[PDB]
C-alpha cells in the first residue's frame, strides 16, 4: 500500500548524501572564516582610519623631508 | 516486509528539514563571504606592507616636523 514511500526511501538516503557532505563541510568552513571575518575587520577598519592620519602627515612630511631629512 | 524502511521514511523527511535549511543557507553565506574574503585580503595585506613604509618614514618625519613643519 505505502509502496511509493518505499520508492522514496531509496531516494531519500541518496539525496541526503549530497546534503550531509555539503552542510557539514560548509559549517566547518563557516567556523573557520568566522574567526578571520572578525579579526581582519579590526586591523583593517582601524588601520584605514589610522592610515589617513599617517598619509596626510607623511604626504606633506615627504615634501619637506626632501628638503632636509636629517641633513 | 520492508516496514522498517517505512519507519525510516518519516524519519528521513524530518531529518532532511534540518539539512536543507542549513546547507543551503550556508552556501548563500559562503557565496557572500567569498566576495569579501578575497577583496579584503588585497587592501589588507598590501596596506600592511605599504604601512611600514609610511610608518618608518613618518615616524622619523614627525620628530623632524615638530622642529619645522612649514614654519
Amino acid at each position: 500500500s505505502f509502496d511509493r514511500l518505499l520508492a522514496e526511501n531509496e531516494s531519500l538516503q541518496q539525496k541526503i548524501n549530497s546534503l550531509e557532505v555539503e552542510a557539514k563541510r560548509l559549517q566547518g568552513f563557516n567556523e573557520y572564516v568566522q574567526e578571520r571575518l572578525d579579526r581582519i575587520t579590526d586591523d583593517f577598519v582601524k588601520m584605514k582610519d589610522n592610515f589617513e592620519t599617517l598619509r596626510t602627515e607623511l604626504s606633506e612630511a615627504q615634501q619637506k623631508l626632501r628638503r632636509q631629512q636629517d641633513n
Side-chain angles (χ1 to χ4, degrees), chain A:
Chain A
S1 186
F2 299 95
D3 298 274
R4 183 175 61 195
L5 299 178
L6 185 64
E8 299 298 271
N9 172 271
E10 309 186 285
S11 185
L12 289 148
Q13 298 291 30
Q14 62 181 269
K15 189 172 72 72
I16 303 171
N17 182 214
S18 312
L19 257 169
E20 282 192 276
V21 179
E22 196 67 77
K24 299 181 190 178
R25 290 188 60 197
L26 294 166
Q27 295 182 90
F29 177 77
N30 296 32
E31 191 63 61
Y32 180 88
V33 64
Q34 187 187 330
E35 180 176 84
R36 64 187 303 220
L37 290 170
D38 182 86
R39 282 298 304 124
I40 297 179
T41 296
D42 184 88
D43 286 86
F44 185 61
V45 299
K46 286 186 170 61
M47 186 166 66
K48 286 191 301 171
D49 173 66
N50 184 87
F51 181 81
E52 298 297 271
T53 304
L54 257 63
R55 189 62 175 152
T56 306
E57 283 290 293
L58 192 52
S59 288
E60 43 141 288
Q62 290 281 271
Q63 110 169 269
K64 302 166 182 176
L65 289 183
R66 60 193 58 154
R67 304 176 183 178
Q68 183 185 150
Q69 185 169 29
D70 193 70
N71 178 269

